[PDB]
Scaffold this active site. Sequence first.
Site, PDB file in Angstrom:
ATOM      1  N   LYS A 209       0.752  -1.202  -0.078  1.00  0.00           N
ATOM      2  CA  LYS A 209       0.031  -0.069  -0.080  1.00  0.00           C
ATOM      3  C   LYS A 209       0.956   1.204  -0.038  1.00  0.00           C
ATOM      4  O   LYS A 209       1.999   1.313   0.169  1.00  0.00           O
ATOM      5  CB  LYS A 209      -0.868  -0.089   1.269  1.00  0.00           C
ATOM      6  CG  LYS A 209      -1.824  -1.309   1.221  1.00  0.00           C
ATOM      7  CD  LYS A 209      -3.142  -1.097   2.303  1.00  0.00           C
ATOM      8  CE  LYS A 209      -3.914  -2.188   2.025  1.00  0.00           C
ATOM      9  NZ  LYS A 209      -5.118  -2.087   2.854  1.00  0.00           N
ATOM     10  N   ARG A 243      -3.736 -10.137   5.012  1.00  0.00           N
ATOM     11  CA  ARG A 243      -4.231 -10.242   3.811  1.00  0.00           C
ATOM     12  C   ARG A 243      -3.185  -9.412   2.791  1.00  0.00           C
ATOM     13  O   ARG A 243      -2.686  -8.634   2.939  1.00  0.00           O
ATOM     14  CB  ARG A 243      -5.318  -9.191   3.565  1.00  0.00           C
ATOM     15  CG  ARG A 243      -5.928  -9.224   2.184  1.00  0.00           C
ATOM     16  CD  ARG A 243      -7.261  -8.378   2.252  1.00  0.00           C
ATOM     17  NE  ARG A 243      -8.049  -8.364   0.962  1.00  0.00           N
ATOM     18  CZ  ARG A 243      -7.317  -7.515   0.059  1.00  0.00           C
ATOM     19  NH1 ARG A 243      -6.217  -6.714   0.125  1.00  0.00           N
ATOM     20  NH2 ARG A 243      -8.011  -7.634  -1.373  1.00  0.00           N
TER      21      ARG A 243
HETATM   22  C1  LIG Z   1     -11.071  -5.752   0.233  1.00  0.00           C
HETATM   23  N1  LIG Z   1      -9.828  -5.047   0.504  1.00  0.00           N
HETATM   24  C2  LIG Z   1      -9.052  -4.079  -0.076  1.00  0.00           C
HETATM   25  C3  LIG Z   1      -8.013  -3.252   0.489  1.00  0.00           C
HETATM   26  C4  LIG Z   1      -7.173  -2.530  -0.420  1.00  0.00           C
HETATM   27  O1  LIG Z   1      -7.639  -2.387  -1.529  1.00  0.00           O
HETATM   28  O2  LIG Z   1      -6.320  -1.681  -0.035  1.00  0.00           O
HETATM   29  N2  LIG Z   1      -7.499  -3.609   1.677  1.00  0.00           N
HETATM   30  C5  LIG Z   1      -8.419  -4.239   2.340  1.00  0.00           C
HETATM   31  C6  LIG Z   1      -9.394  -5.225   2.237  1.00  0.00           C
HETATM   32  N3  LIG Z   1     -10.130  -5.851   2.867  1.00  0.00           N
HETATM   33  C7  LIG Z   1      -9.757  -6.143   4.006  1.00  0.00           C
HETATM   34  N4  LIG Z   1     -10.337  -6.887   5.040  1.00  0.00           N
HETATM   35  N5  LIG Z   1      -8.559  -5.322   4.683  1.00  0.00           N
HETATM   36  C8  LIG Z   1      -7.773  -4.475   3.743  1.00  0.00           C
HETATM   37  O3  LIG Z   1      -6.755  -3.940   4.494  1.00  0.00           O
END
Ligand SMILES: CN1CC(C(=O)O)=Nc2c1nc(N)[nH]c2=O
Lengths: 263, 263
Positions: A209, A243
């Site tokens: 990120k 994740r």
């Molecule tokens: C579905 N996404 C997308 C995401 C992102 O696009 O940065 N971050 C996250 C995410 N889902 C969870 N549970 N946590 C994230 O940081």
Amino acid sequence: KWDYDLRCGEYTLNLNEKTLIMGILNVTPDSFSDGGSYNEVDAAVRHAKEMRDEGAHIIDIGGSVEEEIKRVVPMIQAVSKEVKLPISIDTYKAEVAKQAIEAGAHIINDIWGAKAEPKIAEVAAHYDVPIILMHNRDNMNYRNLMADMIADLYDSIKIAKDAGVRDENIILDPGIGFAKTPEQNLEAMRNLEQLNVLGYPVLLGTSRKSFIGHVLDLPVEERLEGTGATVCLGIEKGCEFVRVHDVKEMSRMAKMMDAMIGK
Amino acid sequence: KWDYDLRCGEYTLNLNEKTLIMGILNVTPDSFSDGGSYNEVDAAVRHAKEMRDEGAHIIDIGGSVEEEIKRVVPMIQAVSKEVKLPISIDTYKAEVAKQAIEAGAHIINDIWGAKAEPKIAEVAAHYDVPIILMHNRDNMNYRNLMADMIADLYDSIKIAKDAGVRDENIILDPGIGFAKTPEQNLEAMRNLEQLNVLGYPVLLGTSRKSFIGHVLDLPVEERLEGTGATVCLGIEKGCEFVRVHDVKEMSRMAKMMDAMIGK
Ligand SMILES: CN1CC(C(=O)O)=Nc2c1nc(N)[nH]c2=O
Ligand SMILES: CN1CC(C(=O)O)=Nc2c1nc(N)[nH]c2=O
């Protein structure tokens, strides 16, 4: 010690053994179909398979309405069919959530923690699936980041519980990179341990990120070490899942952390 | 906050800015000379240069007697001459230490923390260089790993201080992979923070070692992620330097950790 297991219907996830690895399934969508065509679904299956081999414990799938379903349903059908792993569905929409669980998905992954579509918590309640409530807002008028984060996440829990969701089907997520400046993300990282007072498993998503790029001054394809560091602190600060994009690399860091901290 | 800087003659190292990176200089020795020949010294210079570019803050050099000097002196001469960085000398021998500092080395790196040759502390005292006292023993009859480790390290400090070494020229090191079973190493990792009560900067060397292989079941050339994880916990647990092979990779993890913990 968690006195229960994470029940995913066909699959069960123990939370005391190891940090569980959620692999981000990447869907390069066929510019030509609405969804379901061979190339995108084959690539998704193939990619799901690779992550299963690299040590992944969950496959995260998703990323309007009418055709959110058409894209995502055939992917879940194919992946659950071909890869023996729990699939989380990445949506904030109630209707999509239903279809995906109906298509074979096991966990809900809501970047709006039931605030976008409160109805989703009822789907979660109905099918009895674990729902991940992520921290998010439309603004960053934080009076106090961590106090507000915990307050906000709690408002999500209220909505979930009020809709029938069992405590044991609730996972929390600090929501790194959402409604948070580069410094606020760092502050969240530094204070992750505070989310534990709420009494729920925590998932952390920091893979590749912006705030990592901000610190290291490096593009997305150059963020492996930065990601690693966030995953390590996350594990040290008590989180239960991570994740990530790089399953092989993060699995090994996760496992080494586990050994050292005594998980 | 350290109320002083690490004084290395020509160079100064601030301990509040960042985790300092010690790069392990690898010396594939010419099977043909005693030392000093072009290929080994050229390779060392070249390698020192690469690590300087990868974000290294110290170059660690070394790894009998009469010819410890002949191998190591020409390397220090060439590297200090060609690379603007503090060089630590990796020896437990008093005579070698003198020669190396005389040859241009700035820090002592003693895997025996002055117990092998107590005289080294006097060399350290004399030239006024920083000396790294690493934990080591001939046995593992630990009554209590951490209590004994701290006791042992303290016995090193006594020897150093009694020989004239200033508190500000003392760095400690838990000595991972030395006189410690795979589990004891993990236990040391898990309790690193305890070394801080002694009041000295701590260096950690865990790069590519056995206990990482033991956990991950992976060969030496496959230990980057494992190393990373140890470096992260090390930084989280308050250490000031890390001794690593992979300078580029560990620099980035170190830097991301620094940002997150607020160094
Ligand atoms: C579905 N996404 C997308 C995401 C992102 O696009 O940065 N971050 C996250 C995410 N889902 C969870 N549970 N946590 C994230 O940081
Ligand atoms: C000179 N060596 C060698 C070493 C090793 O060979 O594992 N480890 C270390 C070391 N020096 C310090 N200060 N710390 C180590 O862990």
